[PDB]
Amino acid sequence: MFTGIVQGTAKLVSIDEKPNFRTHVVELPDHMLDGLETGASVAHNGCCLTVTEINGNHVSFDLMKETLRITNLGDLKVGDWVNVERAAKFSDEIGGH
Amino acid sequence: MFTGIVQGTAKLVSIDEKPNFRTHVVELPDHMLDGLETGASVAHNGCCLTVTEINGNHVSFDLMKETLRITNLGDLKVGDWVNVERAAKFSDEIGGH
Numbered sequence: 534m535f536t537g538i539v540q541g542t543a544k545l546v547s548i549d550e551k552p553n554f555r556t557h558v559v560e561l562p563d564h565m566l567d568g569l570e571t572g573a574s575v576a577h578n579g580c581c582l583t584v585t586e587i588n589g590n591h592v593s594f595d596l597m598k599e600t601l602r603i604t605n606l607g608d609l610k611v612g613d614w615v616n617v618e619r620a621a622k623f624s625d626e627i628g629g630h
Numbered sequence: 631m632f633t634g635i636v637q638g639t640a641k642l643v644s645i646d647e648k649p650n651f652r653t654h655v656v657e658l659p660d661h662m663l664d665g666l667e668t669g670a671s672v673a674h675n676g677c678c679l680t681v682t683e684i685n686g687n688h689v690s691f692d693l694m695k696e697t698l699r700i701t702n703l704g705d706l707k708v709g710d711w712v713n714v715e716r717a718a719k720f721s722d723e724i725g726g727h
């Protein structure tokens with residue numbers, strides 16, 4: 534089974550560059566603004582990263598510069614949007630089947 | 631469970647534009663050149679699409695223009711690379727993970 538199908542999208546609006554780690558912030562749409570929280574795992578078109586911080590509707594995620602090259606995340610650029618999907622480490626209704 | 635972690639990457643090298651559907655072709659690296667085939671499902675950073683055709687090491691995938699806007703696939707541009715991952719409809723030993 535695999536779908537990689539994204540529930541919603543995000544608008545890159547600001548980049549935060551830290552010589553220790555790179556950070557990117559997107560604009561969360563109405564149906565992703567309700568529910569998502571910092572420390573959550575957001576997959577951008579299916580690449581899971583964690584939310585470093587939320588700037589109101591915006592959300593900054595963490596991205597290592599070398600990981601950015603290793604993945605195709607480096608392709609992101611502000612003014613563009615992303616396919617964003619909510620990911621969770623554990624949940625109440627895990628009981629599969 | 632979710633990782634969206636990609637085994638390999640692809641280089642966008644040529645775009646094929648059909649007024650019926652949009653097509654994009656990438657350059658498959660050495661460890662993705664062996665195994666992948668047309669009609670296979672490739673997830674680009676986690677968005678699954680099917681291989682319309684292989685051009686030697688290159689691989690053209692299908693992408694609807696409206697789906698391209700609906701997803702964040704439209705962000706792709708030649709000269710850039712993608713996080714590519716192999717997906718299959720069925721297998722001899724999925725195992726489940």
Ligand SMILES: Cc1cc2nc3c(=O)[nH]c(=O)nc-3n(C[C@H](O)[C@H](O)[C@H](O)CO)c2cc1C
Nearest residue numbers: 574581582583595596597600601603632633635
């Ligand atoms: C659950 C999970 C979360 C990840 N989060 C990030 C992330 O926030 N930023 C990043 O550059 N890579 C992330 N990765 C990629 C991964 O941790 C690692 O960087 C690559 O496998 C390269 O070693 C994540 C991977 C997993 C499995």
Ligand SMILES: Cc1cc2nc3c(=O)[nH]c(=O)nc-3n(C[C@H](O)[C@H](O)[C@H](O)CO)c2cc1C
Nearest residue numbers: 535536538671678679680692693694697698700
């Ligand atoms: C298995 C699978 C394969 C898909 N392949 C493509 C594709 O090759 N091109 C595309 O634009 N969308 C693709 N999608 C997206 C999906 O079929 C549909 O276009 C979106 O859900 C919008 O209706 C795929 C979705 C699934 C579940």
